[PDB]
Amino acid sequence: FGFQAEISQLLDLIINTFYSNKEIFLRELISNSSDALDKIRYAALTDPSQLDSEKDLYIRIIPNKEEGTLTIRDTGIGMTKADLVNNLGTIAKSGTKAFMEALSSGADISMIGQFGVGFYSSYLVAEKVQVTTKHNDDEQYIWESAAGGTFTITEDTEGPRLGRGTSMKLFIKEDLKEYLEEKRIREIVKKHSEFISYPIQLVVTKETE
Ligand SMILES: COc1cccc(-c2cc(Nc3cc(O)cc(O)c3C(=O)N3Cc4ccccc4C3)n(C)n2)c1
Ligand SMILES: [Cl-]
Secondary structure (H helix, E strand, C coil): CCHHHHHHHHHHHHHHHHHHCCHHHHHHHHHHHHHHCCCCCCHHCCCCHCCCCCCCEEEEEEECCCCEEEEEEEEECCCCCHHHHHHHHHHHHHHHHHHHHHCCCCCCCCEEEEEEECHHHHCCEEEEEEEEEEEECCCCCCECCCCCCCCCCCEEECCCCCCCCCEEEEEECHHHHHHHHHHHHHHHHHHHHHCCCCCCEEEECCCCC
């Protein structure tokens, strides 16, 4: 069995209980994006053609107040279906074990990505996440995540093409729409992501009124 319903319920409950500073979700997403960007930058050293699917390496944040969503897209190396399968099965089970053993030992759990389950820190602010990903060696896939969900990985033949990389669309919880506001987003990136050595872009939209 996969146990994704059980694992996502547990992590949703544990993460929201013990991390009262919800804004670190954006630190974990940018840090995962940065890691994936390092991977394609390195692969392109020996094979320049790896960048033919997308020449620019960046992270872009796209709020949408009408949809209630925050989207973080990068042009990193992306994930094959094998990669996403490995994350949903092997990594989720093992990292959950390490995460809550560190919880239970009173260890310092502030850097949650350390345990490989940094993805689920999205649950601090989001009630569901849609993962789109494209790796040079596979097709574009989409997978939906929610606390208790058992959605299947599906070939994305309807969404916009990524070229290469990963796009995380977070459906923001009702009482937390503050994380869709420009000034709040910019504050959070400045505070938690000074170390990042790729461009971080934010899409702002003119208001009417
Ligand atoms: C552990 O349970 C789960 C359950 C479901 C998904 C994941 C999961 C999915 C990723 N992946 C990415 C997340 C992002 O927010 C942004 C990204 O760009 C990626 C990505 O595509 N990466 C490829 C790659 C290659 C080398 C090193 C790092 C990375 C990250 N993570 C880091 N966790 C984990
Ligand atoms: Cl908007």
